[PDB]
């Protein structure tokens, strides 16, 4: 099975091609993770996936999506990850982390607590920052503050510090969250970036925050560990061919700047779009990026059907298959997939105290 | 759905009728549990089951099955359970524990490391104790030492101390392991008990260790928390009707002595038997015990098919359905069962960070 072939990137070898993508839990307190996360992550690692990427972890308090988001904006926040990293490694999975800044989509309620911007007089909320003072709209009506050049320098340094902390906590894989309408994506998109300084206008200027942040992170992140990013390569906003062309060009610059793998997604920059949701719908776009930028990729959305994961890999659409919600439903999805695909000794996807009893 | 109706016993209310029965993990060191158990148990509790019974936990070192078994023979061993109990409670499941003594089946290898008695010159092994100096046979050839009356008093006191420790660690449900050919079962069975003192011969004498141990435990175990036992009610050894009749009589004495629920199993006392394994094969025998002893029961073996669990409950064969291996395969089996049975808002079997995203 292609799904169960190992994958090596830099000095890291994943035992199979199943990646658990970042999935926010909304269970942290002032950014500090706790036994929610410890058990959640260790349990997933034991389920058999080759790579487990920790949820969007804010580089700065105001870059959380919600009051429940994880953070890594101090050394104490970083040290809270150490036992979880060690548990993921003990289970034979590779520990990764997505470092993030929510930009104009920050200061929102948890998804089951309204999913919308926090009211102005709620003591939990905060001012958001972005390239330009323009609201997302819809359920995120708050107008962000336009960043100064010093704010740009500060946020870049927060990404650097976050990466240094992730490294020292023992993570073996990092993902910069440049997707999903958050700060990085919003610098790239003309919808959200109306700046007239070095950080907006042209393609080079809109790319600049992302490329400078990648380069700054690269100074502290070990060359022998995968350096990755998530990036929305189109919006489904009626501008798809031009946007894809620019996104592919940016992917080439990321590769030239040391990016080892790209997690290909949708922008979610603005609400007025028509995204054609369906099982593995991103496969063809991920394949195009992979081919035209000559860079390994992953993608997500509906790959929890094992045969579809297998087909994407065999078609060379993807190098890793990211499987999210199916792992919330069943932490042992990798074992289910092994059985479904007829892998020999499928139960030994799991550790011995499970595998022995589930043989045949 | 019957499976998702709450159950109250003494002061304890289970949110549904799904019990996770004790399942040895073989991951402890000198009886001390560790992060294997913490994550395993907390993850199961979050999966939705109403009751989670911790694996056979030895009341004394020599009563472990294997070198990897959990123990509760000192206060330090008990305190290791406290964070796990607290995590099970935080998830809304009821924490239980099975306290045990393996008798002649002790000093064995882990199941994936030979499953047989440990060699005499292996530094990990130890002398086993039992009612009579008679080996199980087959892969467990070691002849145990015949217990003295002082040994009987000591082991009873070890059960008492174990129960007191379980209580003080915060367990809300206790199960005495009088099944599966271990010490208690072996005192009851004429196959293994050839004693000619007060603890063997007659029905009353063979029952005596079990009844005295129950009574001694009852002195320290709170009356407001369920006091339960697992007991093998037949062997499939050609003596089934007579053995069932005696086992039912013992169940009546257990009830009269304060037992709140019986986990009905098979004896496994000797190897030369013909057990008719099949899905829910114990249902009719559990029903007979329930009816003839007028005592709540659970049973196990093949109830991981949700419709079969539901049928057993609706037939009043069982009060709780114990689902073991299906929970090793999928820690979130209760959610799977809720979906399969068409329960409203099935994803809310799980906590919010999962349930929200799995709705519909
Ligand atoms: C609970 C939940 C939280 C998510 N949090 C993040 C996140 O932290 N960062 C991110 O890039 N994507 C996030 N996503 C998107 C997932 O990584 C994934 O791309 C998406 O769920 C589609 O894959 P699936 O169909 O296998 O679930 C999240 C999705 C879910 C369901
Ligand atoms: C891994 C494993 C360990 C077990 N350990 C115990 C135990 O500690 N005590 C016990 O009474 N039964 C033990 N059993 C038996 C289970 O509680 C249960 O009765 C049995 O697995 C049948 O249910 P199932 O078909 O749902 O797995 C164990 C079974 C398994 C699979
Ligand atoms: O696509 C998604 C869905 C949910 C989500 C949640 C947090 C962060 C993200 O980046 C997300 O992306
Ligand atoms: O039926 C079983 C199967 C496995 C097992 C393991 C340990 C203890 C027990 O009591 C057991 O019972």
UniProtKB/TrEMBL annotation, chains A, B:
User: Which positions does UniProt annotate for FMNH2 binding?
Assistant: 22, 24, 56, 98, 230, 302, 324-325
* Domain (NADH:flavin oxidoreductase/NADH oxidase N-terminal) ranges: 3-340
Gene3D superfamilies, from UniProt? Aldolase class I
Q: Which SUPFAM superfamilies match?
A: FMN-linked oxidoreductases
Q: Which residues bind FMN?
A: 22, 24, 56, 98, 230, 301-302, 324-325
The UniProt entry, under InterPro entries, shows: Aldolase_TIM (IPR013785), OxRdtase_FMN_N (IPR001155), YqjM-like (IPR044152)
A molecular function annotated in GO for this UniProt entry is: FMN binding
Query: Which cofactors, if any, are listed as required?
Result: FMN
Q: Is Transmembrane helix tagged as a keyword?
A: no
Q: Which keywords are on file for this protein?
A: Flavoprotein, FMN, NADP, Nucleotide-binding, Oxidoreductase
Q: Please report the name of this protein according to its UniProt entry.
A: NADH:flavin oxidoreductase
């Amino acid at each position: 099975s292609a799904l169960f072939e190992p994958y090596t990137l830099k000095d890291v070898t994943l035992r199979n091609r199943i990646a658990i993508p970042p999935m926010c839990q909304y269970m942290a307190e002032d950014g500090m993770i706790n036994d929610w996360h410890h058990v959640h992550l260790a349990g997933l690692a034991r389920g058999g996936a080759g790579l487990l990427v920790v949820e969007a972890t804010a580089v700065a308090p105001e870059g959380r999506i919600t009051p429940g988001c994880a953070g890594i904006w101090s050394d104490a926040h970083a040290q809270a990850f150490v036992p979880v990293v060690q548990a993921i490694k003990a289970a034979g999975s590779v520990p990764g982390i997505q470092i993030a800044h929510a930009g104009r989509k920050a200061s929102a309620n948890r998804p089951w607590e309204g999913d919308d911007h926090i009211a102005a007089d709620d003591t939990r909320g905060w001012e958001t920052i972005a390239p330009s003072a323009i609201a997302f709209g819809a359920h995120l009506p708050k107008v962000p503050r336009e960043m100064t050049l010093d704010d740009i320098a500060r946020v870049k340094q927060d990404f650097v510090d976050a990466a240094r902390r992730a490294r020292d906590a023992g993570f073996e894989w990092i993902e910069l969250h440049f997707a999903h309408g958050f700060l990085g994506q919003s610098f790239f998109s003309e919808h959200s970036n109306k700046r007239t300084d070095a950080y907006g206008g042209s393609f080079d200027n809109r790319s600049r925050f992302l490329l400078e942040t990648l380069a700054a992170v690269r100074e502290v992140w070990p060359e022998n560990l995968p350096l990755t990013a998530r990036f929305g390569v189109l919006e489904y906003d009626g501008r798809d061919e031009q946007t894809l062309e620019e996104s592919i060009e940016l992917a080439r610059r990321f590769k030239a700047g040391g990016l080892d793998l790209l997690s290909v997604s949708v922008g979610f920059t603005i609400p007025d779009t028509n995204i054609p949701w369906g099982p593995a719908f991103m496969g063809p776009i991920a394949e195009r990026v992979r081919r035209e930028a000559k860079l390994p990729v992953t993608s997500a959305w509906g790959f929890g059907t094992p045969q579809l994961a297998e087909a994407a890999l065999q078609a060379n659409q993807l190098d890793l298959v990211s499987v999210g919600r199916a792992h919330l439903a069943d932490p042992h999805w990798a074992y289910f997939a092994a059985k479904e695909l007829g892998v020999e000794k499928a139960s030994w996807t799991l550790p011995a105290p499970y595998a022995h009893w589930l043989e045949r």
